[PDB]
Structure formats: C-alpha cells, structure tokens
Design an enzyme around this catalytic site. Sequence first.
Site, short mmCIF file in Angstrom:
data_model
loop_
_atom_site.label_atom_id
_atom_site.label_comp_id
_atom_site.label_asym_id
_atom_site.label_seq_id
_atom_site.Cartn_x
_atom_site.Cartn_y
_atom_site.Cartn_z
N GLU A 247 2.30 -1.53 7.58
CA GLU A 247 3.26 -1.62 6.51
C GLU A 247 4.58 -0.96 6.91
O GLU A 247 5.64 -1.40 6.47
CB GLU A 247 2.68 -1.00 5.24
CG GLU A 247 2.22 -2.07 4.26
CD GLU A 247 1.32 -1.53 3.19
OE1 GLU A 247 0.10 -1.59 3.37
OE2 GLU A 247 1.83 -1.03 2.17
N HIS B 82 0.77 -1.24 0.00
CA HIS B 82 0.00 0.00 0.00
C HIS B 82 0.81 1.30 0.00
O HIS B 82 0.49 2.23 -0.72
CB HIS B 82 -0.94 0.03 1.20
CG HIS B 82 -2.10 -0.91 1.10
ND1 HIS B 82 -1.94 -2.27 0.90
CD2 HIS B 82 -3.43 -0.70 1.23
CE1 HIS B 82 -3.12 -2.85 0.90
NE2 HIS B 82 -4.04 -1.93 1.10
N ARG C 253 -24.85 14.42 18.11
CA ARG C 253 -25.34 15.74 17.75
C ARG C 253 -26.47 15.70 16.71
O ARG C 253 -26.70 14.67 16.08
CB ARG C 253 -24.16 16.58 17.22
CG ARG C 253 -22.91 16.49 18.10
CD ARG C 253 -21.98 17.69 17.92
NE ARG C 253 -21.44 17.81 16.57
CZ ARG C 253 -20.73 16.86 15.95
NH1 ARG C 253 -20.48 15.71 16.56
NH2 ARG C 253 -20.28 17.07 14.72
N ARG D 207 -16.03 23.66 20.98
CA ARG D 207 -17.49 23.67 20.94
C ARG D 207 -18.09 24.23 22.23
O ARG D 207 -18.81 25.23 22.20
CB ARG D 207 -17.98 22.23 20.69
CG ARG D 207 -19.50 22.04 20.67
CD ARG D 207 -20.01 21.38 21.95
NE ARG D 207 -19.38 20.08 22.20
CZ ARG D 207 -19.47 19.03 21.38
NH1 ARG D 207 -20.16 19.13 20.25
NH2 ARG D 207 -18.87 17.89 21.70
#
Lengths: 250, 250, 250, 250, 250, 250
Positions: free
Chosen positions: D77, D5, D165, D220
């Site tokens: 990997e 990958h 939420r 938040r």
Amino acid sequence: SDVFHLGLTKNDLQGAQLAIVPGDPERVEKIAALMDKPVKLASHREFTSWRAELDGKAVIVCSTGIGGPSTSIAVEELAQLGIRTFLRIGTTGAIQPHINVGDVLVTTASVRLDGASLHFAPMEFPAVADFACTTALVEAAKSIGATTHVGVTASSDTFYPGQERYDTYSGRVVRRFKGSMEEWQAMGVMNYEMESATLLTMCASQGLRAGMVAGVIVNRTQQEIPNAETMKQTESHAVKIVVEAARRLL
Amino acid sequence: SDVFHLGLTKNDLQGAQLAIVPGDPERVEKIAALMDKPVKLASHREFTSWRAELDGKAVIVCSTGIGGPSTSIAVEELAQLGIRTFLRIGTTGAIQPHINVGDVLVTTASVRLDGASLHFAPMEFPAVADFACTTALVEAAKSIGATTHVGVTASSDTFYPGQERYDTYSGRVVRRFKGSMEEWQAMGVMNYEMESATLLTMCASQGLRAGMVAGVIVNRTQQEIPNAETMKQTESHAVKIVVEAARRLL
Amino acid sequence: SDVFHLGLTKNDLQGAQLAIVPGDPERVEKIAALMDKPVKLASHREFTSWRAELDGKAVIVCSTGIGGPSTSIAVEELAQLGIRTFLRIGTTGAIQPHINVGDVLVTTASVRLDGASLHFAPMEFPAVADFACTTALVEAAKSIGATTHVGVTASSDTFYPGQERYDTYSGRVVRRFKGSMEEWQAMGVMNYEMESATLLTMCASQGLRAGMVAGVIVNRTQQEIPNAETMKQTESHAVKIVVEAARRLL
Amino acid sequence: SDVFHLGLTKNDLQGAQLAIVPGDPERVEKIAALMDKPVKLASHREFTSWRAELDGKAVIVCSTGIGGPSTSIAVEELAQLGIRTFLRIGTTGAIQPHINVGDVLVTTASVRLDGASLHFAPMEFPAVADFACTTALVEAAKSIGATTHVGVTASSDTFYPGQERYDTYSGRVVRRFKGSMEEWQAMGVMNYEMESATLLTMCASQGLRAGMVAGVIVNRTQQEIPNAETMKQTESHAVKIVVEAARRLL
Amino acid sequence: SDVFHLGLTKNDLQGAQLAIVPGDPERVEKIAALMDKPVKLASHREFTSWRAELDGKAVIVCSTGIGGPSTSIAVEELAQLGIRTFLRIGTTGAIQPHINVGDVLVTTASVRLDGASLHFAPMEFPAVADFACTTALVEAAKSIGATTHVGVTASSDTFYPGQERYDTYSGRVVRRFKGSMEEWQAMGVMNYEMESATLLTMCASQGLRAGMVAGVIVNRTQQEIPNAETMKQTESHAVKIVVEAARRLL
Amino acid sequence: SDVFHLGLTKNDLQGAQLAIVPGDPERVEKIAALMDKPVKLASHREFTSWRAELDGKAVIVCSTGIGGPSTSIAVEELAQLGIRTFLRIGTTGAIQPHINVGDVLVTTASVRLDGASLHFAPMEFPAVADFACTTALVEAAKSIGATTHVGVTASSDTFYPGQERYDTYSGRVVRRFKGSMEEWQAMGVMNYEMESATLLTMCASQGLRAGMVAGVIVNRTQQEIPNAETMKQTESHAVKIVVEAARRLL
C-alpha cells in the site's frame, strides 16, 4: 498473568472454553455488545479481548489480527488459558458470481496458501472446520434466514498476489498464481481471506474445534458496486450469527 | 456404444442422482438389497453396479476398486451418467485409543497421502466432505443409535507402510513414510482408508456432494481378541447408516 | 493358505518365479489359456491368479487391477510367494501421431504420475524396466511380426485428468496436467497408462525383474473410428508377445 | 483514503518515497520523534503511520505489524503512495555465540523460511537487500561505532509453536523444522526474525529498494539473562542507525 | 601430488587468502598480468591458475571452467589450500533493455537455477554475495569510471533451456523454464550466467567471502545492430576492476 | 562457427551423425586412435573436437567436461550440427560389493540426483537410455568377454558433498547427503558419477539416441585407488567397448 501478548490471566474467563475471535479488534467490542455482561479484559498489541456470558455460560471474544503469524499467537495463548472451541467471524469478498454481497459464508475447509499452518501439520493434512461448529453455523444463519453458503475458502497470506489482484504497484502476480483465481472458481471455492488456514489446521491438529463464518462485504466479480450504507450487514447478520452459533455449541 | 469402463448407459441409471460407492462388489449388492427394486445393471472389471430406489428415487451402487486411481474412474464414469451424490461406505481400523469396534467414523476430510487427488486439485486444496453428505451420515448413526466419530482420515496408496505394519519383505519406504502413525495419532486422525482422498477432493474441486462413513471393524491399539461376530454386525449398521443417509440426500 | 488377500501360497504357486501380470481380471484366464495346463486359482479382488506352465516351468498370470496401489498389493504378495519376474500386459492410449492402433508397445521407462511409486522409491530414482525383460519382450515382438515401438510410457494414476482428457463431467484439468499431453508428445513419451510406474519402480528399487508390454487400443490423435471389438486382435498380439517373451525369460 | 488498509492517501506523504517499517507502532511514533516536523497521519489496523522531515525531505514511518502478511500490505500500500524504498528495523536475538547484545546486524539477504515470500517470487530467487540501503545502514553504524555484523538473517513464520525448540504445552514438535536451528547457525546466520524474507523479496522483485538494521537485545546460545537498560540502549542505537541510514538515502 | 585436480599445494599460494576465479583458463594470465611477480602454478584440465601479488600480498588467480559441479571442485580445492575469498569475473547476456554491452554488473545475490549449490544449503538460504566483496566491486567499477549496475543475476545450470533459449535443435523449453525470462526481467534480474549460485552459495554457507562482476557480451533484449568489434574492450574492463577491487580487500 | 561453444561448422562433421562423449580431452584422441583416418577439428574450452570414420562413416569424438551443465552444451551443440547418437564412455566408482574395479558397467537409466536434467524434463520424467544404444553396448562387451554389469547409476552434481564422504569440510550435510550412497546400495544402484543424468534426460526427451559405458577405476566404497599399470587396461576396455558399440549404430 501467565500468557504474553494477551495479558489476560486464567480467571478472567471464569470457565470460558469458547472464543469468538474476529479479525479487527474494532469488532471485538461490538460483538460483545450483542451478548450479556461483557468486560474489556485486555488489549495489548492487536489482541483486544473481552469477556461476556451467555446461557449461564462464560465465553470470550478475542481479536486475532491479520494473518496467521499473529493468528497462532492468539489461538496459542488463548487455547492454553482454556478455550477448546474457536469461532471465527470476519468480513470478506467472494470470487463466485452466484454469491450476492450480504450472503454469509460458513466454511467447511480452506485452501492453504500460507506457510504458517505448515508449522502445525504437513501440507497433506486438511484445514477443515469442525462439524459441531459447522452445523451450528449453518443452522444459525438459517435461523435468521440468511442466504448462507457452505463450501471452501482460499486462505492466502497476501491481500494482493495470493488473491491475484493486478490493480497494484507492480501489477503482476507471480507465475504460480497467474490464473489461480480462475482455478479457484472452477473448483468451487467461495472467497478469499487470510487467517483460517492457520486456525482451521492448528485447531484441527490438537483437540481443538473451530469454524468460520464471514459476510460478503464486497465481491470482485459482480459488476455494479454495493454501498457502504448497506455494509453494516455484518452487524444484524454475521456478528449476530456468530453470537447465535456460539450460543448453540455452548 | 457407451461408458468405456463402468459400461452403463443413462437409461440404466433411470435418472438416478445418488450413488453408494463401496470397495468390492462382494458387498455392493448388500447395499442395493436393502433398497427397493434392486436390479443388476453392469459388472465389468471390478466395476459392478446395481440400481434400486429410495423414496421413489433411483440410487446406484457401483463398486470402486482399490486405491484412488480405480475409484477415480467409477466416480467419473458415474457422474457423467447423472449422479451428483457419492456416499462411500466401508469398514475400517482405528489409531485412537478411545475408539471401539462398534463405532462409526464420519470423515470430514482426510490427509491426502494418496496420489490421484493431485490429478484434480493441488495438495493445498482441502479434501473436505460436503456438508449435506457430512451431516446426513450423522443423522443416521443417531437414528439407528450407533456411536459416531467425526474427524480426519489418512489416505495413502499402500496397504502396509501406511497402517503401521511391515513384514511383506522388501517393500521400501521413502524417507517420509515411517512412524507416520505416531504422528497423525497426535494430530487426531482415526483411520487408514485409501480412496476418500480422491473422492472428497475430486468431487470438491468439481462441484459434487460426497461423504464417507466407515464402520470400525478392528483397532490395533488394544491387545483384545477381535471376534468375527461384530466384524459383520457393525458393518450392517454401517450399511444402514449410508442407506439411511441416501434417503435424505434424494 | 498364506494369503487371503490374493488367496494363495508358495505351495499353490507350484514354486515358479515369474508372473505375467495384467490389469484386467477378465484376461488372466485368457492368457494362461495360451500357456499350458492352466488351472483357475482364485478370484478375490480384481487380483485373479491362474497358475500354468511354460517350456517346463510354472507361471502364474495374476491380474493386478487398475492403479498402482492396486498393483502394489498384487506384485507385493506374488513376490513373497516366489515370483522374481513380472511382465505387464494391457491396453494403452497412444499420444504420438504415428503410433497406430493395434501396434505393440514396449516400455523402457515411464514418467511417474502415480503415488504408490513413492511408497517405494524417491522420484529421482528411475521408473526403468528390466533390460533382460525389455530385450526378451522386444525380441519376442519381432518373433511374430508385430509393429512394435520401444520407449518411455506415461503412467498416470488417473485415466482422465492424468491423461489429460477433457470430455469428462467438469471438462477441466488441474493446471499440473494442463498442456501435459503436448509436453509429453514433444518429450517423446509414446503412450498413456496407469500401472507400469508402480511396477517398474517397486521392482527396480528392490530385487525384481519386471517388464512392460501393451497394445494401442485407442489413439489420442486421429479422428477415424475405433472399430467394434478393437480390444481383441491387440490382446491377441501382446498376449502372444508377453507369453512368447516370458516363455524365454521363465 | 487512497488505500484499503493504511488509511493514508497518496497525498499524506508529499513526495515521501522513503519509509521506515518496524514491528509495533509504539516505535514508529518515537522513530518519527527523531526526525523533524513529526505529524501522526493515521492508525488503521496494525498500520500506524507518522510523517516527518529530514533535510527538507518527506519520509514515512509506518509500522508493519506481525508477519509478512501484515508487512506485505504496508509495503504494498506504501509503494503505491510513492515509497520506493523500505527500511526495516527491529529488536532481536542472535544464535551466534560471538554475537553479543548491543551489536547491529545489517542484513544483505534472509533465508526465505516463509510462505508469504512465495506470493511474490520463486524460492530460487534471492531474498536480497539493496546495495545503497545496506550501505547507508552499515555506514551509519560506522558513524556511531556500534559493533556491526553484516550478513544473512533467518525468517520463518513462528516464535514458539511448530518451531523446533521444546516448550509450550503438549508433545508434537513439528518435523521439517526440527533440530534445524543448528544448521542455521553453522550456515553463518545471525538472528532469527520473521518479516524480512517478505520485505526483501517483495521489494527485490518489484523494483523497490529496502534495508534492515536490527538489534541484539538477547542471546540464547549465550548463557546470560540480558539487561533491561541495554535494551533501551540497544533500541536507541538502531533507531539513530536506521534514521541516519534513511538520511543519506535521499 | 596433492589433491589431484588443481595441481597445487599450500606452499604455491604463498599465504594467499584470496583467489580470483574466472571461467576461461585462457584469461588467467591476462588478470595475473596486471599484478606484481606473476607466476604460473598448474595447467591440468580446465583448472588453470597463476600466482601473483599486490601491495606485497600473494593472490591466487585460478579458473573454474564451465559449470558449477566443476566450480565446486575449484572453490573447494582452493579454500582447503588457504583461500578465504573468491573473486569471480565473467562475461554475460543482459536481459534488461536499459542494460547494454560494455557495462559492468555487480551481483548481490543470484537466482539458484543451478543444482550443485543444494549440496551446500537449503534452497531457502540466499545465494547472497559477500557484502564487502560487493562494495569493493562496485567502488572498483566506479574508480575506473564504468557504467555499472548492481543487483540480482540469474544462475542457470544449462545455457539453452535454463536461459530460455529457443534457437536449439528441439526448439522447446520445459514448463519450469517456459516464459521464465519475462519473469526474471520483470522481477528485475539483470543477467544470466552459469556459476554464481554455486560460489555465492558454498561460500556464504561456509564462512567465505565472495564477489562477482561480469562484462556484458550480449543483451538478450536487444534490437539495434551490434557495432563493429564488439568484445575486445568488453572483456578487459572487468579485468582491471576485479583486480583493483581485489586490492581493496587484501 | 555455427556453434557457439564447440566452435565447429556443419561441414566439419562431414555427414557424421554419431558422437562419442567422453569426459576429458586426453581420451578423445585415444578413442580416435583406433578409428580410421582421425582428424583434430577443434578444442575450445573443455570441448576438444575430433573427427574419424568407422567402417567408412564419419564419426565424431568430442569432450564434454565436468558436470551436467557442461555436458548439455557439447551435446546440444553437437545435435545442432547433425548428431543424433551420443555414446558415453568414461571411468567410475562402484557402490556394489559384488562389483569390482576393472569391471565394465552400462547404465540403463540413472538416478536423477543432479540439477541440469531438470531443465529438460520434470523430475517425474525418467533418465533411461535409448534401447538400441544400450543394447549395442552390453553386447559390445561380450566382444571382450568382460565382467559386464548393467543397471542404473547415480548421477550427482559434486563428488563428496553430493554423496557424503566423512572427511571433507562441510562434515555430514544439510540433512540429505548423510548416507545416500548407502541408500543407493539398497536401491540396487551400481555406480556413482555425474553427467549421465543430464545426458540421458536431455537426449531421451529430445529425440536423441543416447548411451553410457564406464568401468571401475576404483572400488569407491570397497576402499580402493587406481594406478597406471591397471588404470590404462580398464580405460582400454571401455575405449574399445564404446567404439565397438558405436560401429553398430551406423
């Protein structure tokens, strides 16, 4: 535009309701070379979207990327721009000996071995494809005469342990999976991949339809090794297939 | 002697490959009847099987019982006698406002809120309908002209706390099982049967083709007086769909 | 009446609170026959009631069917009809080497291998049989001289995979139930069975006096012969013990 | 290449044995621009890797992508090519009122709210960070004077849908993960992230050390739209902080 | 007089904010023995606590007894009385061959094989030790010059099955704990103990620092014949460590 | 000696094959006071070992400690030394309003709300008491004609944080213990306590006769608090009931 990680507006589609979403965005461009009048809509993170027509219709090919954590993003933001049919096309390696590399796989439902799908529905609820997108994928494969396989796919979250691979660093898969694969074959499941669990279920749980087709690129059973030279099958086949299937359900 | 429960022998099956597995025997023959050379074979606890023919082939019509545990027997005592196809016919109710009493619901797969399914494959594995049996039950509702609905079904082990109804005095309900309907409703589930959970899964996990057609006799959604006429009419049509569906799977 | 499901009402029940409930419908009459002035009551599903009388008070043997979801209905309706005491009698497979065929078994509590149980109480809650009934039954056991045994029973929602039977179609067992028998055996569990758990739980959880008694029809250990109608002298025993027992409780 | 990958070989690192794994590649290129001798090695899929030096040491700065699935492939990997220690860095927000923008959140262990982690270890095993690593990280924020907070981070598989939420489109707002954000806060958690849990668990259980320093670009609970510059700032400190952590760690 | 179980009040700690909590009450005086102005406070049951001082700061030296249900009692009682930092010391059985007896292990976050801890936080949450407390512990075992190992510890609610011990009466461990040792070791867990998880858990989820160091008494993976007096010096090492490390925080 | 924690040797038991497992060491002697020729054998941590002899047979009385973790050691180590029966006697709070302080209750089985049990048998496995051991107790209470209540109990791991007591620090709970005790009233559970769960389970699954008596030294829910005048009488009620019971098991 209005979305976020896809940067396509709402007119980029021009009444697009279907979307041939593939894994690698390296494929999104060649998938559209198969249809007509495309356009490189956007390409932000790993979300490369194009826009092509077909039978007078408007459909888009957007890449989703590895795993559902990302997968849901695409499905999320695309489905709110309008798409209500998500056709997935990617590569893979099957677990059953009876499947010869270069066989196509239409998948009715997948074995949920991920924790993202659970964010859309209980583990009770099935990650089953859509009949319309499923029949339109076994006829498509049959149309070109491809030795198609319809069954279930084990949708893991890791490319190594969820698929019980020991040719790794540690070389050990956690208990819950020590033998999972030998169980998967005995239950008939076809192969391993990592995005359907999310897609299948998040679509099946909200007025969205979808299906999955994949080409056996390799196969962790069949002794003799393939050839990369003949690994282009995804082209004239799977890629062709998805473009054709999408034609139908247009 | 022979089969511990069903009580049959291969001879009786006469090389039969298929089997229509309804709930009660009170309507088991009604299927047989619609076939050629109906011949009562066995009838023990609530395991009552017949045997007819279809296009020169042999079909079996054994009843399953109540809940997945019962069925698990028929579908296993049966498969050993030869049968590899299990079509399940039965009337049902509806959770979706857009579904009527004449409609037929083809289950792709079902949410596995049952219990005996886990005896065959982890709740991760999908309880999906084999393409053929899934497709075949669509051909019929379209060859007879009936309106069909594809989708997911809920499959619990309770006749009341699982279909939105609570008046059988005590009958406790764990923290989960409550208001569930309102949930599935948003998720797309249509009915509340009780058997397909083990049917789909057990067969799926064990290499067997199987499907399930259900005529919607009633539907809570509206406050319309449900006549008795159609509660019998639509059924026959539901008997015709499987019967017309068995002909193809032979 | 007040029930079309089981087909009866309080008026029908003669006004008696106690029901011996077996799983086989072809044994109902067979047990009520050893009672007094038993009168056939109905025969809808596998639920078949047979009113009667013992030592001056009414009783209603009512078949419960195979599987806890079957029994749910059974016990559930009988109860809102009057019954506050239930005594299950049936056939059972023994795990232990020393438990012999014909021997009678009394269930104190059982391992939960069903689903209906949960539609009533969490799994931390016990599947425990009523002491009084456990006592009445164990007492009545010696009241004839039967070779009895008391202890935990294993209630599976499946005869084969759940009671780890390999001589089935596929021949494999979900890892969950793989090795189980060994573990049960080691853990002392004395027999396999599929209904006591839903029962003992649905009752225990609420206000109901349930009890359990069975007879070894087969021994999942020895290699000898399971005779011919080895399903009779046993019923003779237990039927008596469940009749003698109930007779006391009434 | 030696992997399947990353597209790197067990030779493009030259000892490396240490790597820094962030979200996007856009950062791993500038991350490496902070160490000497930058050398972009590849960019296959969401895995863009650069090589750099630090006090004559070889170091990898490959990006992970989105979610543990992607991250699992990289860390796996990598570990194969030599990397034995993985240091993570990311932008983020904090739920804790007292936690402000520009603060650094060194994490010791994260709340395994994912499914990926499960492919590497039981839920009871901790998703804990290495001692030297959490130190090299904490100490490096000290040699910078950045308001550092050490502790536990939350990491599930979402960022809007299926979360808790309310704001996407629709109505279904999950179940299991509803009104939970509250507990995570009073549980003492700091930030919300989605790749740690895997990193910590796939390293903590496979003999590989790992760390994680992130940045608070927004809060938040704190009623205030953050600052674009503070984020270029905040980013920067995490970069120096993690690179400086990587420094001593050799 | 106050609470009950502890046998103390606020004015017996003298402003102390730190509590050292070992298991053996026979070993409280030995720890408080190394601090200034030691004083015994209460001896009720297994809960034995002495009051001391260090650098002019009153520090409580309380016991927890065997097990975590009792450990909660202790920890919970103290905190109420002022303590906001718990230093747990112990003895243990290492599972890694590389680890021998006489060494010192610092627990980063342990496996919750316990149960009482779930009464505090979801299994997802990590049984992580407080960072600070760990550092002081590690740098304490070094200042005295002690072969140390820091990492993951396994916290079991049982001493026989939980730690997969077979030299028992039954000589049989459950599925959840069979072959779980190779599991733990391979995963890298360094030892086994019975209280860590409850402490690390009720403290990390409740704004409380906490640390644990233990002295090797046995090596689960051992082959050499244990020397002469193998204990006396074993148990006293962590005593000066825990006390020293206790300084660094105070 | 032969046992690690208890610290006794086989001869010390003197052929004894039965033990009374209280909670604390104050009681172990008051119990051995009634029996003939009592002798103190040992007392290591929480386990205080005593020997006696009922009707000419060696009887052991040993303390188990707080919580299941501790119990399990005393029990197993006792069984390693030849004990097959364990009589539990203690004191407890009642959740039932028809039940009052000064009453004796026997637990047929318990509601596995603990963590140590889970290391003996799956959560499916029931926590029932050995018939003989539980029958020689309901009848050994008739010998004292006392308000005997016998049903299931609720074994928790902690006092208030495992049953919900609005007053402590944690407040409500991590969404679970927000009214369970109120659920258990509905469940029919009579009392609340701790060890039983593990005690029944580990015995029931290992071939060890086990029991459990206790009385209410407080109307737990029904706002009460014990005292010397009464508390002793109650503790006598049980101390005798458990010695009288123990007599009949020899």
